[PDB]
Amino acid sequence: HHHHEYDWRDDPKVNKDIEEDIRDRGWHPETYDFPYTKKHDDWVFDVTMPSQNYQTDLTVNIHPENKKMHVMKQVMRQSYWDAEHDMAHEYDYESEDLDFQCESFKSQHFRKKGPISQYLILGLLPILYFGTEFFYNHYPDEDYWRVAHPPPLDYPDTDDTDDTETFKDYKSFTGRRMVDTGIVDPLWYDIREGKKVYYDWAGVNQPMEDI
Amino acid sequence: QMFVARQVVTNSKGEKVEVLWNAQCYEDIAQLNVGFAPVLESVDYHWEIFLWA
Amino acid sequence: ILKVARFRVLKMRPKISTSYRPHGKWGDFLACIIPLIWCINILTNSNLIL
Amino acid sequence: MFFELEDIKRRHSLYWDIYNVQGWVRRPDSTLYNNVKRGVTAGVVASLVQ
Amino acid sequence: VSVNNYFYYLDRIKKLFTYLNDLRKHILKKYVYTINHKRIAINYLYFSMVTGLSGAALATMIRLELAHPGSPFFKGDSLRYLQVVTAHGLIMVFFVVVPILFGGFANFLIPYHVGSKDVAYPRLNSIGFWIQPCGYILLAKIGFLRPQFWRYYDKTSFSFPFLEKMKYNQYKEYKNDYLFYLDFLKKEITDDHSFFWKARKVIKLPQYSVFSFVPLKLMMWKTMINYPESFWYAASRVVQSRRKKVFVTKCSARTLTTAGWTFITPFSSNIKYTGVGSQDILILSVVFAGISTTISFTNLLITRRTLAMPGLRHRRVLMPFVTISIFLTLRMLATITPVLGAAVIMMAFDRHWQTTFFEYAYGGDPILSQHLFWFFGHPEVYVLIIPTFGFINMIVPHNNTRRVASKHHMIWAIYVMAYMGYLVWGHHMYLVGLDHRSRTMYSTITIMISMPATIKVVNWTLSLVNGALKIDLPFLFSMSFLLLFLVAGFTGMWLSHVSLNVSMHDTFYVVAHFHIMLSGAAMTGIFSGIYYYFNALFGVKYSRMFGYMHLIYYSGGQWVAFVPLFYLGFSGMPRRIHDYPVVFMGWHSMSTTGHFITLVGIIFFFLMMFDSHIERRASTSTTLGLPRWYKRISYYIFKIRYLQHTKSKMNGIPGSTVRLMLINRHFVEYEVYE
Amino acid sequence: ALCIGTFDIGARLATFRWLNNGWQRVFAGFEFNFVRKIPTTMLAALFTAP
Amino acid sequence: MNYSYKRYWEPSTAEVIGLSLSVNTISAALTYPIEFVKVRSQIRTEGVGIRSKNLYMGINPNKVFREIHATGNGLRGFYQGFESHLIGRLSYLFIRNLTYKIIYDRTKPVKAHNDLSHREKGVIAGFAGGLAAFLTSPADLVNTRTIAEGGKPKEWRWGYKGLMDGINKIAATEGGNAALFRGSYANVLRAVILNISLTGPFDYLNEKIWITFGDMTWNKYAALLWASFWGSVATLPFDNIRTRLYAQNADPTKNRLTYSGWADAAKKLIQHEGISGFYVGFYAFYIRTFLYAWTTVFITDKITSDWKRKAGLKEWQI
Ligand code: HEA
Ligand code: HEA
Ligand SMILES: CCCCCCCCCCCCCCCCCC(=O)OC[C@H](COP(=O)([O-])OCC[N+](C)(C)C)OC(=O)CCCCCCCCCCCCCCCCC
Ligand SMILES: CCCCCCCCCCCCCCCCCC(=O)OC[C@H](COP(=O)([O-])OCC[N+](C)(C)C)OC(=O)CCCCCCCCCCCCCCCCC
Ligand SMILES: [Cu+2]
């Protein structure tokens, strides 16, 4: 039972640093009782339907299009947990508290929503987990997610990458004729100095240096 | 959500009895609002649906 | 699709469904004629190929 | 070196992969001046008509 | 009087520590040690979200590999691709759909719908939930794990010399025989307590007779004499040489693979073909999954038979259709779990004891293994699909505020489908050479499973008509489920055509069939059930905007991802190949695009959960306490309360005249005035 | 229109091109990994929003 | 990874002094109103703390900015302390860079690709920052009080029209030059923590992103965002306590809370505000740190890359 004293720092009316949630205009979950037993919606008239009797009043016509503005009724704010009180309500005394269910219905365990930042993880779970399975674990391998760079001129060996030979294969007689056939696309690089420079239309990045 | 309607009738005993048409759910107690306020919101979330077994 | 999407929402002539129980007996037999025709066609074509 | 944070630049050895044409490869025509020119042209024409 | 305590910050810190300890105890007693079925179901749902993300990541790996030919993802690692495919299939069947449905929905709704205080075995419920994670981990990480854990550039020759103990076998001779030991010490030392690595390079330096090729990390024994780790650091990634070629072998252990989620023999049941490792992991994990399923269906079926409410002991027509479907699937799992367990136990015995259960040379037959697995197999898929029928049969009448078309006939249709599930197991074995009598029996009993499903379709369609429709978010998911189930059902019926199945067995046509059935229809029904019980699951109203985004991206993504798979199946694309003819790359790319659309939908679903828990608004049922308008007086009461509620909502919003005035006079930017 | 197509629409287009020029397509298929362009387009829209 | 450093070209003492002074002046001019808002936010909760709940915890930087602009001075009213903040910032940077360059040149490794470890560089930077913050404590004290006198009653305002004016007023009213170093220890701690909480995380995430994604261009900026976040987390409590000690008037009557030192300030912050009170103005401080670091790193990278290209370093050495 009971409650602590008054502190103006906790009062939104006095402490202007407390930002007001306009979606909680008429709802104060800290005053909620469990189970909820307070009526907050009853008959409302004189909004568009007058509360008086003009059914057979030939001098009065009802125009609901002229509905006067009223205070907006926000959707009901869910209850917020009172941690300590909750941790004092569901607390168990070992070997001195009987294993029984009380007669009062207030012993029911009600679910009151808590902090929100935890669900931020739930917001980013499909991203982070995927990163955890592709970036942190580097699956399938290290070089898949890296930006693609071709190997340099004749690296790591002329067997895997016979670029120089390919150059000759495109500068020899036969190679030229092959390009004339149109079944072989033109050469996609040039050997300048000891470096291989890809043409702009090739569509690849330049090879990295041998640092 | 407690009672959708109220009614006053007279039985064969001449008594002015009260009948409260409750709010129902379609086969799902999960979809039933187990509340004790004259409202329409589902404010109460009971962890133990059958508290006293 | 037309009847449900154009005349079955709350604002467009809904129906007061006063029906305690389903009372269908041979509706399954009548409706399963179309699957029966499909089975006949599949069996005939498959056997003729086989 | 200059302030609290040092943007350490690290040299790295060569790496390469099997394929080269399905990742991030900056286009040659995508320069600052060219992008600004084309975007400004399209934007001013569309804005004038709008 | 005035109190000047020197430790006020310290009083605050003491209160913080007390709060943290009390909160730890509260969390342990409420979410870890609890037997509460609702909390256990919520934990099941979150664990299932994690496992569904794992399965989606595995499917993403598969689709990235299949995006275009040439093995762009695994780079020729066919064994790794097969392991990934098997893990995806197994954890999607046994650790996403089954956990979601049974764990979450059963443990949440059976106490509700049947009307029982918790379950018959709360201990068994907790046990099943907390034994799920080990099987999930074992079945989901076989794509990352194999006994050949080292990569092709890992110089095993740097550390494996430290493994060979046959090098010191000579000294083992004289440990119990000192007689000649002194003579053994008079020999010539060649490689005694020393390691020599042969030249790995051609060095032309005649000044040096011998060149030391000791690994660079093994030179200073001091640094290694106090390090409590194996010598693998000297062999793990110590060379820059790489071979970025598809044809090079990155495993050198061709046997280290798996045989798909359908264990095919003798491939599964022989170390000669599937080496020790992932295959054994899968077999024993299936044993464990069978044990967990046994616990689950025991706990759930004893509850309804014993702890049911007095009026719903035997009248299954009164329970919600999801509960009817769950109980039917639990009985089906009760029947098939012993068969599956026997099959996998026989596979394990054949692998590690050479019992030759499936070796034809001396009596065995792999066809027996196929028969056992598929006897379990098809009833498993019918277990997976049926509860979604319950989800739609609950959601559609709720929003339409009318009775379902024929609940009795739908129940008998799903029950006869369950009956036929035990005589159609052979339609997966048309080509294995079964006798024509059995093959015809399987075909004729399979084609007649279209009879019960069409009853379900007709009943859903007739439930959609002649009622007061209240469009919600679960309803749209129900429509998506119906649309997806229309396609997969008729394609599967086509798969019972014998000649077509001959031309479509083990094909992406079958893949698209059971993915439109499972990935599309079953997961869409699961999502619809989640939205339908969102308040019951979380206590707050869900987020319409991100929910609609998830609905749009997830539902269409299934079509975009699995219609091209139909087109590929008609083109002759065999399953379980990471490389294919280049005439399939367009539709494979379209399928991967659809999969990424589905991933965006999943992102939107997690975002909608996050935004709903930001919102923190109490949910109001659309029925307003009158689910059924059995009487015109009930209709009048609902209409009055609905008008009052709408009037209450429309406060703070200006009237029609004011809004029209503002809209008409919005524009205020003029040049010349009077 | 000149002011808004030079500094707003043109800036949007220039930032989008500067951020999304290098995402190459697939030769005979479709750009399956379009999710890589979502954080990039979000950054482009945020940068040119004000 | 210690082989991977790239120190082929190292700027001279004059070069580092000039570049640091110029680029840091530009950054401080760009991002001073953010620090004005941050100091303003830390003062309006000097004894109240965070009293809102859930997503509303903290003080809205946009709300503070709107109020300060509605004061009537406009954007020009955010640089009152910038008149004195710039001199203090530049003096701190000059002293810190001199000490850092001297200690580094007396201890740097011989090989151009070998650099001191993050721990050694953190020790050097912490010593340099502590020394410079102790030497620039009067300037930082004058700067903070100029910002502080906007959210305080007319009786509590010091009324400093500049930097030398503030120095003279403090040396006269509060006893002497010894009163110029109020909060000097707090400033020293703030500089020490700030000098060690950025390079570490920045290099961490930059190298890990490179390993994951190769030599892309967003790697350094994402790492800078991460480093700014972690530096703000590590430094904000010390900066908050420094602001509290700077804004504490000599007269005990003109103080919402009276502190006898850094420990007393921390104790009272924990007692009245709580643990969450140290991170008031986190968004403003983090945005300021990120923008300052981005401007400085970008301009320094451009200038130093141009100088390396002029000097003749190979493109992989730049
Ligand atoms: C939950 C999953 C699920 C469901 C419900 C089904 C349902 C059906 N399945 Fe199948 N199936 C699988 C999951 C499922 N299946 C899996 C996973 C495999 C492969 C296992 C593996 O090998 O890996 C498989 C394999 C499989 C094969 C083997 C293909 C091959 O390998 O050769 C065959 C063929 O007989 C088949 C048939 C059927 C039939 C006839 C139905 C019927 O029950 C469906 C009938 C339903 C309808 C008929 C309703 C549709 C209604 C209509 C009115 C359609 C008409 C509409 C239009 C034409 C617009 N299935
Ligand atoms: C129900 C099971 C299930 C599900 C959902 C899926 C989903 C998907 N499947 Fe698969 N699949 C199988 C069962 C499933 N699959 C089986 C049994 C096999 C055969 C194994 C074999 O061939 O041996 C198979 C094989 C298979 C292959 C074969 C590869 C090959 O043979 O070449 C491919 C490749 O295209 C593929 C693709 C996909 C894709 C792109 C999805 C996408 O739909 C993925 C979308 C992601 C989700 C659907 C997860 C939902 C996310 C959540 C986090 C849910 C959790 C949240 C809650 C609801 C609480 N699947
Ligand atoms: C220890 C605690 C946890 C640590 C977790 C660490 C990771 C956290 C999660 C990731 C954060 C975001 C990082 C984005 C960086 C993007 C940079 C970039 O250009 O990337 C290019 C890459 C690759 O683009 P690509 O398609 O051109 O390259 C394919 C590979 N080659 C080059 C061979 C053709 O794209 C992405 O990474 C897209 C990221 C989108 C946003 C999602 C982030 C997670 C991504 C996981 C893998 C991809 C799954 C896609 C579907 C996801 C659905 C959920
Ligand atoms: C992101 C910006 C995108 C801009 C795209 C469009 C660009 C082209 C159009 C630009 C129009 C605006 C600039 C006009 C410049 C010329 C006028 C001028 O400078 O006059 C002298 C102005 C006059 O200011 P003034 O306020 O005295 O104006 C005089 C009129 N009264 C007094 C009545 C209000 O002087 C200054 O601005 C002095 C300060 C220098 C600039 C400071 C910039 C600060 C930027 C924000 C920093 C962060 C703040 C906190 C944010 C929230 C917390 C994190
Ligand atoms: Cu089957």
Measuring CA to CA, how many Å separate E413 from each of E330, E407, E419, G180? 17, 10, 10, 90
Backbone angles phi, psi at G253, to 5 degrees: -70, -30
Residues of chain B contacting residue A110, judged by C-beta atoms under 8 Å apart: 44-47
Residue of G nearest to A120 (CA): G55
Query: Resolution of this entry in Å?
Result: 3.0
Task: Enumerate residues 6+ apart whose C-beta is below 8 A from E571.
Answer: E583, E584, E587
CB E401 within 8 A of CB E623: yes
Task: Give the residues across from E469 on adjacent strands.
Answer: C9
User: Would the CB atoms of E455 and C24 count as touching at under 8 Å?
Assistant: no
Backbone angles phi, psi at E208, to 5 degrees: -110, 125
The annotation status of E193 as a binding-site residue, yes or no, is no
Q: Is the CB of E52 under 6 A from ligand 2?
A: yes
Q: Is the CB of G128 under 6 A from ligand 4?
A: no
Distance CA E299, CA E122 (A): 8
B 1-53 residues with CB below 8 A of A? 35-41, 43-48, 51-53
- Which of E112, E410, E635 best probes binding to B when mutated, by most B CB atoms within 10 angstroms? E112
Residues of chain D contacting residue A207, judged by C-beta atoms under 8 Å apart: 14, 16
CB E402 within 8 A of CB E463: yes
Q: State the CB neighbour count (10 A cutoff) for residue B26.
A: 17
Q: Does C44 touch chain E (CB under 8 A)?
A: no
The dihedral sign for the CA sequence G166, G170, G176, G180? negative
Backbone angles phi, psi at E553, to 5 degrees: -75, -35
Touching F (3+ Cβ pairs <8 A), the chains are D, E
User: Would the CB atoms of D30 and F21 count as touching at under 8 Å?
Assistant: yes
For residue G288, give both structure tokens: 């300021």
Q: Is the CB of E99 under 6 A from ligand 1?
A: no
Q: Is E66 helix (H, G, I), strand (E, B) or coil?
A: coil
Distance CA E289, CA E135 (A): 7
For residue E266, give both structure tokens: 């003798």
- In this structure, which amino acid lies at residue E196? F
Closest CA to E277 of E266, E285, E289: E285
Touching C (3+ Cβ pairs <8 A), the chains are E
The annotation status of E617 as a binding-site residue, yes or no, is no
CB E106 within 8 A of CB E300: yes
Q: What region does B42 belong to: left with phi over 0, alpha with psi -120 to 50, or beta?
A: beta
Task: Enumerate residues 6+ apart whose C-beta is below 8 A from A151.
Answer: A160, A161, A207, D14, D16, E244
Distance CA E418, CA A122 (A): 37
CA dihedral E610, E616, E618, E619 (to 10 degrees): -20
CB A144 within 8 A of CB E77: no
Q: Is the CB of E454 under 6 A from ligand 1?
A: yes
Distance CA A169, CA G316 (A): 31
Mutate to test the pocket of ligand 4, among G40, G68, G76 (most ligand atoms within 8 A of CB): G76
Residues of chain A contacting residue G212, judged by C-beta atoms under 8 Å apart: 135, 138, 145-146
Residues of chain G contacting residue D19, judged by C-beta atoms under 8 Å apart: none
CB A71 within 8 A of CB A27: no
Q: Is the CB of G223 under 6 A from ligand 4?
A: no
Touching E (3+ Cβ pairs <8 A), the chains are A, B, C, D, F, G
Please report which ligand is nearest the Cα atom of G33.
4
Facing B30 at nearest CB: one of E109, E117, E628 = E109
User: Using CA positions, which residue lies closest to atom 50 of ligand 4?
Assistant: G34
User: Would the CB atoms of E240 and D18 count as touching at under 8 Å?
Assistant: no
Facing E589 at nearest CB: one of F30, F35, F38 = F30
Q: Where are the beta strands (DSSP E) in chain G?
A: none
CB D2 within 8 A of CB G300: yes
The dihedral sign for the CA sequence A83, A89, A95, A100? negative
Q: Is beta strand A189-192 parallel, antiparallel or unpaired with respect to A195-198? A: antiparallel
- In this structure, which amino acid lies at residue G236? L
User: Using CA positions, which residue lies closest to atom 51 of ligand 1?
Assistant: E486
CB G284 within 8 A of CB G34: yes
How many angstroms does the Cα of residue E511 sit away from the middle of ligand 2?
Answer: 9
Q: Is the CB of E568 under 6 A from ligand 2?
A: no
Residues of chain A contacting residue E23, judged by C-beta atoms under 8 Å apart: 83, 87
- In this structure, which amino acid lies at residue G318? I
**N- to C-terminal Cα separation, chain G:** 18
CB E458 within 8 A of CB C36: no
Q: State the number of CA atoms in the 13 A half-sphere of F24 facing the CB.
A: 20
Q: A173-181 and A163-171 are packed helices; what angle lies between their axes, rounded to 10 degrees?
A: 80
Facing G20 at nearest CB: one of D3, D8, D11 = D3
Facing D14 at nearest CB: one of A144, A204, A208 = A208
Q: Is E523 exposed, middle or buried (0-12, 13-18, 19+ CB in 10 A)?
A: buried
Facing A211 at nearest CB: one of D11, D17, D26 = D11
Distance CA E318, CA E297 (A): 21
- Across the A/E interface, how many CB contacts are shorter than 8 Å? 126
